[PDB]
């Protein structure tokens, strides 16, 4: 459950460390973003000389949420942080590595390169 003002960790190597969701790119007025949804975000904290810098308005897909995700089989999954992978307008990740587990919901939503790059899919 991500919304504008929500801070997200960056689970890639773009240089970005903290991004702040400013929009949920899901229709006219979606209240919340979950795993596999795209957001617009401000890059609030970055390491020096990365691809993106502080101030950049970027897109990302949310890979992990602290609000548990429910699944048709009756199970659920919950992460310790809210994390996102920064992407381009073609949904491809802009970094070359993905740090940490990602939700299997990303697969079924066409984020296969990200799923591939992720060290564990849960």
């Amino acid at each position: 459950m991500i919304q504008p003002q929500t801070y997200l960790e960056v689970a890639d190597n773009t240089g970005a460390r903290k991004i702040m969701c400013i929009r949920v790119l899901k229709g006219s007025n979606a209240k919340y973003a979950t795993v596999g949804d795209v957001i617009v975000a401000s890059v609030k904290e970055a390491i020096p000389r990365g691809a993106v810098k502080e101030g950049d308005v970027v897109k990302a897909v949310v890979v992990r949420t602290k609000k548990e995700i429910k699944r048709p089989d009756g199970s659920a999954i919950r992460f310790d942080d809210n994390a996102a992978v920064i992407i381009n307008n073609q949904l491809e990740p802009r970094g070359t590595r993905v740090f940490g587990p990602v939700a299997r919901e990303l697969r079924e939503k066409g984020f296969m390169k990200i799923v591939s790059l992720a060290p564990e899919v849960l």
Partner: peptide, 17 residues
């Protein structure tokens, strides 16, 4: 804890999965 990230996962105890 999975690759530096804590993950919790809820299972139905009588799931056929």
């Amino acid at each position: 804890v999975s690759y530096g990230v804590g993950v919790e996962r809820i299972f139905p105890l009588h799931s056929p999965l």
